Design a protein around this ligand. Structure first.
Ligand code: HEC
Ligand code: HEM
Ligand code: HEM
Ligand code: HEM
Ligand code: FES
Lengths: 109, 79, 55, 54, 68, 239, 378, 54, 54, 54
């Protein structure tokens, strides 16, 4: 977790097993449909805003029913991709405009 | 009205009162006081207590069930 | 009446004691704090020679 | 009788009632504070640093 | 030579002789045998370890500060 | 992961009118300044606050002067070092959080000024955290920079066992077993978190006595005033 | 004529306080209202002395409170009196509302509506005040409660950012909350004066629920001492709460400096908001949960309309008594679940409790009232 | 009777402001009480908004 | 702490780390902050110009 | 008379409010005027300095 605009920014180096788990998730089951690869420029790296889409809480990583994220406030469960699947959260974790200029860097203006 | 002079109409209702210094601050403490409190508690007990007893049962069951669910099942790794 | 007035007087004595304690506590809270009080007389100036004028 | 002089001198006029109330407040404050402090010191004797500093 | 005996250890052992601490410890040993025997398993003896430590330290707290 | 409830140890000050053992507070302060001060800061405790709890003013001055601190800028604006005075707070081991994380394998040693009151279970937990450092149970593995501790929420703390027998030599001379050391630290931390403990207990006893005096008296006054109504008898005499 | 009946200020004081016709059979519950005002005074006085040292900056709020507790003379007493006095204020407020529900005081429609506004202002005041310490719980609770406004369909995020004073809770938010927390209690006092003014027109109600014009009594020599005794008991409770268990009604996580990069594992609001927290959690949809909380608070407005009984008071309605105590037990269930996390049993029990709360206050109570009306052959 | 004479708040407002008997020959110098009230309201609002950032 | 190229939100550079350095580098005199110097002097800018002129 | 006395109290309250508000900016004028006006209370014969320091 990093600090951007006074808000948490999550960068998770999800393993390929987590990538398979996220890809296998059906779009119909998702509350807000979205393909896993759409929200990750690189499959092994997922960059999101560490703010629960329900009531601005820091989702706990590798926790919950789906082992991606878990809201400690109202019980919202997010997957490794950040998509909401169970809980009061209305939509998926926000994806910033991150650009991988190099394999070891990520910046944007 | 709003002042004590004109509030309602009453006729031939006579009341007797005693000075606070003449009488006792604690009369009938044991002859009537404690029995009166006991009868009040008896009257109000069975219309209040059952709801909180149900609440206590729900509380205990919920806590025990949360503890039971938190515990791990061996069958998950029998193989 | 003397017994009743004695009861009232003892009650008033207790109330006055409690009220003075509360008022003094609040007023003292308005007074100088411990951190301010510490840096009051401990500090000692070490002055050099500033020419022949007021410094 | 005790009351025949007490009530006639102290509790008769409310000004004297207030005066004896305030004097009793002073004496009660002093004595009650001393007694409470003694009780608290005795209950946890040795723990307090007032005893240790000796 | 090691004069300090750390009464904590003595009280801990005193529980380890009591019925609840003993049965929790033996259940922990059974769980350890299970996990060690299985080559590939995700089962962690943390639960039974906590079950043992709760009773152990409960007895300790009952009879520890007296020595100190 | 699950969590372990810390036992309720029979601390001396837990009594209704009990007070902190100031000898224990002094020993715990010694352990803090000699063992935990290398990583744990106390930003809200100065070298005063000790003039009336465990140290006289003179020995407090000496103890403060033992450690040098940075002073305000002098001529040319070159901030120098001072011998150290009472109003100075306890030294911070690291200039900033980043230095603490770098020196502690990415972990930040938390401020211990309010640690007792900032953790569920209070001092009990802190004691249970220091005493309990069992080896990892079968089936759990952790990074070399982490040590298994059953009472630590995550169960993998980044703090090596800080106290062991004879790690410190108490001025009093009591046997410096790890249990005694941990108990003394916990007492000192309880004092630091709640310095008003003794005064609060004294005022609580005083208010208990005052209320035991007043409540029956005010109740008697109310009964006396209302006896006119409660004994009032009324009759209906229609013509 | 006595001087009290000549000077206009003395006229008002005598008419409203000294010589106010008050029912003789009034029980202890009517004390709480007076206690509320006292609590307000306490919160206005004590909090004032806290403001003389509190610095409303995100970088110095926690340090300022530490300075208050450790350096300021008797400052710990003042801070603990303030916190536990807020707790006692909500205790007395809940008991006041429960009494009003039980004895049919809601039929004073305008007084009831004014009281609802007072409750809302008190809730906002306490929320911002709890945000003031700038602890972990304070910060994250503030973030959650302000993000609640994001549920609004169109102006959802603009309003939240306007309240925040930025893109997230920070020093701007704390200073705004400090100013609102300073101003609001005086608005509460004026609204309470309006409360008493609207109550004065009809006078106080009695437990029997029957007009007590036959047995009215001056307030000066009877209810003054009865309230004084109530004040003594309230101060007993408050002082025992601040002097023996000062942190009984507190959260340890609030003693860690606010960290915007890590939400505590068990972030919960203060205990008076726990029922609203459960009603939030139970409803899945975010806007649904926000609306559920709003209805949970504002159902007191609809309560007078649902009154369908020939008797104002409930002491002669045993079935209504059973329903009322069931509602109270339900509220206790809600508070307890609010204390508890979001897991298998607690979630379902909370959903059931919220549904039961709404049904009892909307369906069971009027039906039982109609049944009781038929029972007495009206 | 109009609503002014029925609702107690409306009673107060009508008696003190809407229907308050005042002299007709009152000059501009009596306008400064309302001006002082407006000054107080302005100071309260403006100071609140200032303290929001002070 | 490191050096950064400098962004919009940065304030204008401070010539001296503290007042003591400024006094040392300017013969014991402190050069006042110029952010309010016009409003801080009687005559305003009119004064400042004259100060730079005469 | 009563209205006049209430007005005098109002004038005193407004003067105190404005004085403290002018102290609030913490400018040179604010600081030194505050010092002067507060030290004015040192004239009190017996409790002068204690009151000022309080
Ligand atoms: C030389 C370094 C060092 C020593 C010695 C040390 N600590 Fe720590 N402490 C740390 C670090 C680093 C952590 C972070 C571990 C973690 O959070 O996983 C820590 C963790 C803690 C925690 C856990 C706080 C939490 O978030 O739960 C407490 C309480 C604590 N220490 C108190 C103590 C006490 C009491 C002593 C000795 C009497 C002590 N420490 C000795 C550096 C130290
Ligand atoms: C700061 C909060 C409040 C204050 C200071 C306050 C004050 C008072 C006082 C002093 C009384 C006099 C009678 C009594 O004490 O019982 C009263 C009565 C009443 N209050 Fe409030 N109150 C508050 C909140 C509320 C709330 C939250 C409600 C309803 C939700 C409410 C509704 C009523 C009603 C209906 C009565 C009529 C009592 C009767 O008929 O006997 N008040 N209030
Ligand atoms: C109904 C009235 C009030 C309520 C319900 C209330 C409630 C609270 C609460 C719950 C806190 C949190 C304290 C803590 O958690 O430690 C707080 C803090 C604070 N309040 Fe009050 N308050 C009231 C009135 C006031 C008033 C009138 C003022 C100022 C004039 C004030 C100033 C403060 C300050 C400065 C703090 C921060 C100090 C602290 O947190 O201890 N409050 N308030
Ligand atoms: C009786 C009405 C009031 C008067 C006469 C008054 C007067 C003043 C004055 C003369 C200043 C100094 C202005 C300056 O030199 O910059 C000031 C500043 C201030 N006042 Fe007030 N004030 C009043 C009401 C309020 C209220 C109700 C607040 C509520 C927060 C408030 C908050 C402030 C603040 C925060 C400042 C500092 C900011 C500034 O200097 O402009 N004032 N006031
Ligand atoms: S904040 Fe994540 S569930 Fe509402």
């Amino acid at each position: 977790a990093f600090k951007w605009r006074g808000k948490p920014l999550f960068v998770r180096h999800r393993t390929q097993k987590e990538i398979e788990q996220e890809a296998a998730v059906e779009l119909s089951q998702l509350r807000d449909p979205q393909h896993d690869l759409d929200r990750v420029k690189k499959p092994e790296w997922v960059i999101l805003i560490g703010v629960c889409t329900h009531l601005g809480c820091v989702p706990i990583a590798n926790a919950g029913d789906f082992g991606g994220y878990y809201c400690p406030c109202h019980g919202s469960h997010y997957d490794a991709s950040g998509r909401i699947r169970l809980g009061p959260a209305p939509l998926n974790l926000e994806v910033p405009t991150y650009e991988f200029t190099s394999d070891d860097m990520v910046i944007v203006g | 009205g709003r002042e004590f002079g004109n509030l309602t109409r009453m006729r031939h209702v006579i009341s007797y009162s005693l000075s606070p210094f003449e009488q006792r601050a604690y009369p009938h403490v044991f002859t009537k006081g404690i029995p009166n409190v006991l009868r009040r508690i008896r009257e109000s007990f069975f219309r209040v207590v059952p709801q909180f007893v149900v609440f206590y049962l729900i509380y205990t069951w919920g806590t025990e069930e949360f503890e039971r669910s938190k515990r791990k099942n061996p069958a998950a790794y029998e193989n | 009446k003397g017994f009743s007035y004695l009861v009232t007087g003892v009650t008033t004595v207790g109330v006055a004691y409690a009220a003075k304690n509360a008022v003094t506590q609040f007023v003292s809270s308005m007074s100088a704090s411990a951190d301010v009080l510490a840096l009051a007389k401990i500090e000692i100036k070490l002055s050099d020679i500033p020419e022949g004028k007021n410094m | 009788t005790l009351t025949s002089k007490l009530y006639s001198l102290l509790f008769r006029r409310t000004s004297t009632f207030a005066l004896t109330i305030i004097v009793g407040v002073m004496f009660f404050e002093r004595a009650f504070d001393q007694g409470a402090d003694a009780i608290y010191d005795h209950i946890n004797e040795g723990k307090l640093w007032k005893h240790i500093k000796h | 030579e090691e004069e300090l005996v750390d009464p904590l250890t003595t009280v801990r052992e005193q529980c380890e002789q009591l019925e609840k601490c003993v049965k929790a410890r033996e259940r922990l040993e059974l769980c350890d045998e299970r996990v060690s025997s299985r080559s590939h398993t995700e089962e962690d003896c943390t639960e039974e370890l906590f079950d043992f430590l709760h009773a152990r330290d409960h007895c300790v707290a009952h009879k520890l500060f007296n020595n100190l | 992961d699950l969590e372990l409830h810390p036992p309720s140890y029979p601390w001396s000050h837990r009594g209704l009118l009990s007070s902190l053992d100031h000898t224990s507070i002094r020993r715990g302060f010694q352990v803090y300044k000699q063992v935990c001060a290398s990583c744990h800061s106390m930003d809200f405790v100065a070298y005063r606050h000790l003039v009336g709890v465990c140290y006289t003013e003179d020995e407090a001055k000496e103890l403060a002067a033992e450690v040098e601190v940075q002073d305000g800028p002098n001529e040319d604006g070159e901030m120098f070092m001072r011998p150290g005075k009472l109003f100075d707070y306890f030294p911070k081991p690291y200039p900033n959080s980043e230095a603490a994380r770098a020196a502690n394998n990415g972990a930040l040693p938390p401020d211990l000024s309010y640690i007792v009151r900032a953790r569920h279970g209070g001092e009990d937990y802190v004691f249970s955290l220091l005493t309990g450092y069992c080896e990892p149970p079968t089936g759990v593995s952790l990074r070399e920079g982490l040590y298994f501790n059953p009472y630590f929420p995550g169960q993998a703390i980044a703090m090596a066992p800080p106290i062991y027998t004879d790690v410190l030599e108490f001025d009093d001379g009591t046997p410096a077993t790890m249990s005694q050391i941990a108990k003394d630290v916990c007492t000192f931390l309880r004092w630091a978190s709640e310095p008003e403990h003794d005064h609060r207990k004294r005022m609580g006893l005083k208010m208990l006595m005052m209320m035991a005096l007043l409540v029956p008296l005010v109740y008697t006054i109310k009964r006396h005033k209302w006896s006119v109504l409660k004994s009032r008898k009324l009759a209906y005499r229609p013509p | 004529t006595p001087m009290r009946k000549t000077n206009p200020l003395m006229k008002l004081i005598n008419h409203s306080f000294i010589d106010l016709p008050t029912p003789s059979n009034i029980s202890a519950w009517w004390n709480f209202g007076s206690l509320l005002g006292a609590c307000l005074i306490l919160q206005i006085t004590t909090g004032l002395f806290l403001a003389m040292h509190y610095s409303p900056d995100a970088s110095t709020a926690f340090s300022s409170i530490a300075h208050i507790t450790r350096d300021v003379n008797y400052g710990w007493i003042i801070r603990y009196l303030h916190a536990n006095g807020a707790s006692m204020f909500f205790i007395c407020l809940f008991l006041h509302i429960g009494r009003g529900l039980y004895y049919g005081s809601f039929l004073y429609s305008e007084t009831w509506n004014i009281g609802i506004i007072l409750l809302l202002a008190t809730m906002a005041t306490a929320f911002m005040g709890y945000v003031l310490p700038w602890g972990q719980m304070s910060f994250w609770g503030a973030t959650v409660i302000t993000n609640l406004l994001s549920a609004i369909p169109y102006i959802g995020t603009d309003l939240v950012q306007w309240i925040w004073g930025g893109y997230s809770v920070d020093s701007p938010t704390l200073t705004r909350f400090f100013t609102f927390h300073f101003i609001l209690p005086f608005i509460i006092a004026a609204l309470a004066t309006l409360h008493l003014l609207f109550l004065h027109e009809t006078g106080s109600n009695n437990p029997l629920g029957i007009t007590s014009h036959s047995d009215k009594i001056t307030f000066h020599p009877y209810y003054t001492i009865k309230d004084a005794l109530g004040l003594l008991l309230f101060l007993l409770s408050l002082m025992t709460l601040t002097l023996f268990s000062p942190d009984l009604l507190g959260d340890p996580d609030n003693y860690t400096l606010a960290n915007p990069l890590n939400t505590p594992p068990h972030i919960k609001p203060e205990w008076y908001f726990l029922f609203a927290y459960t009603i939030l959690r139970s409803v899945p949809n975010k806007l649904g949960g926000v609306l559920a909380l709003l209805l949970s608070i504002l159902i007191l407005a609809m309560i007078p309309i649902l009154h369908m009984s020939k008797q104002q008071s409930m002491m002669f309605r045993p079935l209504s008594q059973s329903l009322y105590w069931l509602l109270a037990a339900d509220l206790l269930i809600l508070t307890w679940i609010g204390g508890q996390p979001v897991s298998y049993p607690f979630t379902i029990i909370g959903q059931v409790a919220s549904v039961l709360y709404f049904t009892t206050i909307l369906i069971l109570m009027p039906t039982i009232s109609l049944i009781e009306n038929k029972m007495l052959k009206w």
